[PDB]
Design an enzyme around this catalytic site. Sequence first.
Site, short mmCIF file in Angstrom:
data_model
loop_
_atom_site.label_atom_id
_atom_site.label_comp_id
_atom_site.label_asym_id
_atom_site.label_seq_id
_atom_site.Cartn_x
_atom_site.Cartn_y
_atom_site.Cartn_z
N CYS A 114 0.75 -1.24 0.00
CA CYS A 114 0.00 0.00 0.00
C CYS A 114 0.78 1.31 0.00
O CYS A 114 0.18 2.38 -0.11
CB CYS A 114 -1.03 -0.01 1.12
SG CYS A 114 -2.48 -1.01 0.81
N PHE A 156 -9.90 -4.29 -0.16
CA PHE A 156 -9.21 -4.39 -1.44
C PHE A 156 -10.01 -4.59 -2.72
O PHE A 156 -10.87 -5.46 -2.80
CB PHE A 156 -8.08 -5.44 -1.35
CG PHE A 156 -7.08 -5.17 -0.25
CD1 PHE A 156 -6.79 -6.18 0.69
CD2 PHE A 156 -6.45 -3.92 -0.12
CE1 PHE A 156 -5.87 -5.94 1.75
CE2 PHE A 156 -5.53 -3.66 0.93
CZ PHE A 156 -5.24 -4.68 1.87
N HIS A 177 -3.13 7.94 0.94
CA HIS A 177 -3.55 6.61 0.54
C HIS A 177 -4.74 6.19 1.41
O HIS A 177 -4.64 6.20 2.64
CB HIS A 177 -2.40 5.59 0.66
CG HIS A 177 -2.83 4.18 0.38
ND1 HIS A 177 -3.27 3.77 -0.86
CD2 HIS A 177 -3.00 3.13 1.21
CE1 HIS A 177 -3.71 2.53 -0.77
NE2 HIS A 177 -3.56 2.11 0.47
N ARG A 197 -10.99 3.67 6.11
CA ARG A 197 -11.70 4.87 6.55
C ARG A 197 -11.10 5.43 7.85
O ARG A 197 -10.94 6.64 7.97
CB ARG A 197 -13.18 4.58 6.75
CG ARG A 197 -14.04 5.83 6.97
CD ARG A 197 -15.09 5.62 8.06
NE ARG A 197 -14.50 5.58 9.40
CZ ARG A 197 -14.53 4.54 10.22
NH1 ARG A 197 -15.12 3.40 9.86
NH2 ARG A 197 -13.94 4.62 11.40
N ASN A 211 -10.00 0.28 -1.88
CA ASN A 211 -8.55 0.36 -1.71
C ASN A 211 -7.92 -0.47 -2.84
O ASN A 211 -7.90 -1.70 -2.78
CB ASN A 211 -8.18 -0.19 -0.31
CG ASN A 211 -6.68 -0.12 0.00
OD1 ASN A 211 -5.83 0.01 -0.89
ND2 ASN A 211 -6.35 -0.25 1.28
C1 COA Z 1 -11.90 -1.81 8.98
C2 COA Z 1 -12.52 -0.46 9.38
C3 COA Z 1 -13.11 0.23 8.12
C4 COA Z 1 -13.76 -0.70 10.38
O1 COA Z 1 -14.22 0.61 10.81
P1 COA Z 1 -14.27 0.78 12.34
O2 COA Z 1 -14.83 2.15 12.46
O3 COA Z 1 -12.96 0.74 13.03
O4 COA Z 1 -15.31 -0.15 13.05
P2 COA Z 1 -15.65 -0.67 14.48
O5 COA Z 1 -14.84 0.04 15.53
O6 COA Z 1 -17.13 -0.71 14.74
O7 COA Z 1 -15.30 -1.98 14.48
C5 COA Z 1 -15.57 -3.30 13.77
C6 COA Z 1 -15.04 -4.58 14.54
O8 COA Z 1 -13.68 -4.91 13.94
C7 COA Z 1 -12.66 -4.92 15.00
N1 COA Z 1 -11.33 -4.71 14.10
C8 COA Z 1 -10.90 -3.61 13.37
N2 COA Z 1 -9.73 -3.79 12.74
C9 COA Z 1 -9.39 -5.08 13.09
C10 COA Z 1 -8.23 -5.90 12.75
N3 COA Z 1 -7.24 -5.43 11.96
N4 COA Z 1 -8.23 -7.21 13.32
C11 COA Z 1 -9.25 -7.73 14.15
N5 COA Z 1 -10.36 -6.99 14.50
C12 COA Z 1 -10.35 -5.68 13.93
C13 COA Z 1 -13.01 -4.12 16.16
O9 COA Z 1 -12.16 -4.71 17.06
C14 COA Z 1 -14.52 -4.32 16.02
O10 COA Z 1 -15.09 -5.50 16.78
P3 COA Z 1 -15.33 -5.87 18.33
O11 COA Z 1 -16.54 -5.11 18.74
O12 COA Z 1 -15.57 -7.45 18.18
O13 COA Z 1 -14.18 -5.47 19.23
C15 COA Z 1 -11.42 0.41 10.13
O14 COA Z 1 -10.95 -0.22 11.35
C16 COA Z 1 -10.10 0.70 9.34
O15 COA Z 1 -10.23 1.53 8.38
N6 COA Z 1 -8.96 0.09 9.73
C17 COA Z 1 -7.68 0.41 8.91
C18 COA Z 1 -7.70 -0.62 7.83
C19 COA Z 1 -6.30 -0.96 7.29
O16 COA Z 1 -5.75 -1.29 8.09
N7 COA Z 1 -6.04 -0.81 5.98
C20 COA Z 1 -4.65 -1.21 5.50
C21 COA Z 1 -4.57 -2.59 4.85
S1 COA Z 1 -2.84 -2.80 4.37
#
Ligand code: COA
Lengths: 405, 395
Positions: free
Chosen positions: B167, B218, B309, B313, B342
């Site tokens: 990424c 993705f 990038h 969200r 993404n």
């Molecule tokens: C995925 C995403 C869109 C979800 O939005 P969010 O606002 O955080 O949503 P929520 O807080 O309601 O959470 C959703 C559930 O996923 C969990 N979660 C989020 N990221 C996680 C991960 N990497 N692994 C395991 N659980 C994860 C929370 O723990 C939550 O559950 P729980 O109530 O069982 O504890 C956001 O976490 C995000 O954008 N993360 C960055 C993604 C990323 O890393 N991209 C790079 C890939 S190289």
Amino acid sequence: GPGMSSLSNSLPLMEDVQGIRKAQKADGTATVMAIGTAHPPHIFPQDTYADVYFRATNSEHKVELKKKFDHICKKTMIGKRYFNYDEEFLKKYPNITSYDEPSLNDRQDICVPGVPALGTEAAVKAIEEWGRPKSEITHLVFCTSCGVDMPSADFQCAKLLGLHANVNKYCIYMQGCYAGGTVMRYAKDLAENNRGARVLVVCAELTIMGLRAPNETHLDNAIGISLFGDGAAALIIGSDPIIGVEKPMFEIVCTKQTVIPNTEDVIHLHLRETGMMFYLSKGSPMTISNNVEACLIDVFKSVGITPPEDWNSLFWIPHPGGRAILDQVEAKLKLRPEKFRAARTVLWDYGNMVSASVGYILDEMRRKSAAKGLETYGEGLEWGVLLGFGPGITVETILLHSLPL
Amino acid sequence: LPLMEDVQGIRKAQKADGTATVMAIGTAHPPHIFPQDTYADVYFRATNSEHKVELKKKFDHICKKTMIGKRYFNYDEEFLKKYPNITSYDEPSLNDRQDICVPGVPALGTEAAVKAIEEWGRPKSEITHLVFCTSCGVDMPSADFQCAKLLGLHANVNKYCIYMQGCYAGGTVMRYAKDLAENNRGARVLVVCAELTIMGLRAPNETHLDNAIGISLFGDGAAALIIGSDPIIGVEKPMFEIVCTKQTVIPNTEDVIHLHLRETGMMFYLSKGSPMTISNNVEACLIDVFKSVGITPPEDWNSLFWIPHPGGRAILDQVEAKLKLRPEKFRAARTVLWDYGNMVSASVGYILDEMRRKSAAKGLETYGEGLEWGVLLGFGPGITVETILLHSLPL
Ligand SMILES: CC(C)(COP(=O)(O)OP(=O)(O)OC[C@H]1O[C@@H](n2cnc3c(N)ncnc32)[C@H](O)[C@@H]1OP(=O)(O)O)[C@@H](O)C(=O)NCCC(=O)NCCS
Ligand SMILES: CC(C)(COP(=O)(O)OP(=O)(O)OC[C@H]1O[C@@H](n2cnc3c(N)ncnc32)[C@H](O)[C@@H]1OP(=O)(O)O)[C@@H](O)C(=O)NCCC(=O)NCCS
């Protein structure tokens, strides 16, 4: 020197784009100022390789194939090779020593941490010869065809060396036997376009990624296994050498990559569930030889130099892909029998170490030149060429200017 | 043969004068549209995991939180039926993924390249360098070779294959292009970022919940750019000048984002603290890129244009909050995350395209939303941050 702190090279006080560019770029040509090499501890003599390979791969029952392979081993003009494994290590992996059993995971588990480790060994020697602090390395160009991972081999090497967190990294993955030339091409633009920049080039290979049992219908794979050896070469490259501190050796004047059309099926490797599958056509020495002169003419004309009437006027660092590649390129360019001596010495003592071979040859050349009290690092000559040959068919042509001793 | 004193004259004649400049951007994506509202249904059905009701409820919630509306893929449900090994969790699948990605990625990349070269308007014979980027598939000869072959470029084009840089790779290509264009007079660099996410597609698992997060993010796509120094007046259209490019590794964060290429394809691992690591260290990367060129960092980050990038969200939200940015600042990035998801290395190219197109349509003063300076940011495995300082030009 780079003159990083000088007034003439200072950054503009106002946000002047062109003023920033003038201050940011280097003045001179990218120059090789240190070469370090490393190899794993296990020695495999070529005169007993047919015995060792056929025993380790449960293939000693294939009597006629062994006699054919022993003949190929004698023709390679390789005396010994180094590997990160011995016969005892291979017994733990019956899947690697087979022909097509699932083995990528095991090869990755060895190559992913092993390649940066071997490369770091060569890098430590290059940094020691250079003499300046490792914190002053601004760019890292890591190169390997053995193992892939995220974060990549460059990250792992930087971590093991303890380089600055802000080092600009370049990971050259799977560029095969031409990659030793590719790193010189990368290093040239990186060093020349950045004032004060010191590029650490690291080429490291662990050929266990391609090791497998011999097959009668895939004879070309066994031929590759008779050539490939493990090794690492590291170089420190930078523009504007500091007098009294750094030792400038070879100036990288022109660097061009060329593809020979209609030859995609000549040298090709695929990363499968069984590891790296190697394929080679009988026509590789002749294909390379029939097109090498045009690549040289291009590199000379690109910098306005009239190509020499006699190719013997130059020093040479050709990639030792095979003995027949060296023999046929030598014949086509009408070169005297000793022009490729440095390449033949490395092929004899180390085999084909993929991207690391040309670094080893450049090291052999500068060391032998100093040892004989010659005029320059390039066999007493001023101009020369480093050549990489590999998948495509792709030729990397690197024009070098040697500085005096 | 020239003398020792002539080597510098050769160097002077070989180097370019000005700053590397983006002069064309082209994009492409595969035809199969997958809306995010129905993704939980489609994914769990295609992977025969309809019995995992509790995991589907969790996945549907994550999909609603992604702020992705649709994604494009080179496959549909019918295509996936031919590959039951790819739709399972851990059955051998690398060979099949390679057979799709090795020829497919340069094919998709070439589509984006065709659009970039057409906008540029100059002959393809004038392309001297090719920088190809992908985290989907590896082969010898590489994806760069295949792209050059499909486009029918000159035999002596200097090629650069950027494999598995994840990424942050959309930033890495700008770093490569900067040095290639600036150190070579007349050089025109074709940059191509292409990704086919089927390399990481697999069935959901309760013990590997972070893999499901990745599958919800993705999408496939390609972005291509033409970069060169010394723009030809009246022929070329100079847009963004690449002033400074720096790569940074955030220490002690290797276990945050990591991917491994195995017999089962690309295995994705993600820590829940990724938005925090990125946001808490981004400001230091910005101060560093400005200091490197002697420019005093602005007191208000809203004074710059932004191409971050869209890793997720939460990454966008937390970077926005840390830099105290107003909601409209990441408009281009949020529209791309919504419309395309993404797309790995291709996302920043899509955002840069969206930014210059909207700026031209609104009749703004520069291609960078009417503002002079801006930053393109790549975030990925390491944790690695690619910080690209850009100066935009007038319309
Ligand atoms: C995925 C995403 C869109 C979800 O939005 P969010 O606002 O955080 O949503 P929520 O807080 O309601 O959470 C959703 C559930 O996923 C969990 N979660 C989020 N990221 C996680 C991960 N990497 N692994 C395991 N659980 C994860 C929370 O723990 C939550 O559950 P729980 O109530 O069982 O504890 C956001 O976490 C995000 O954008 N993360 C960055 C993604 C990323 O890393 N991209 C790079 C890939 S190289
Ligand atoms: C391998 C090598 C050292 C053998 O030396 P050689 O002088 O050609 O030896 P010989 O002519 O006696 O031949 C040995 C046998 O191998 C065969 N052979 C050579 N290369 C072969 C290939 N790629 N595939 C199948 N057979 C091959 C010959 O056909 C011959 O057997 P045959 O009489 O049963 O037909 C030489 O061919 C060579 O250097 N090849 C270049 C290797 C190379 O390509 N390296 C880079 C790829 S990354």
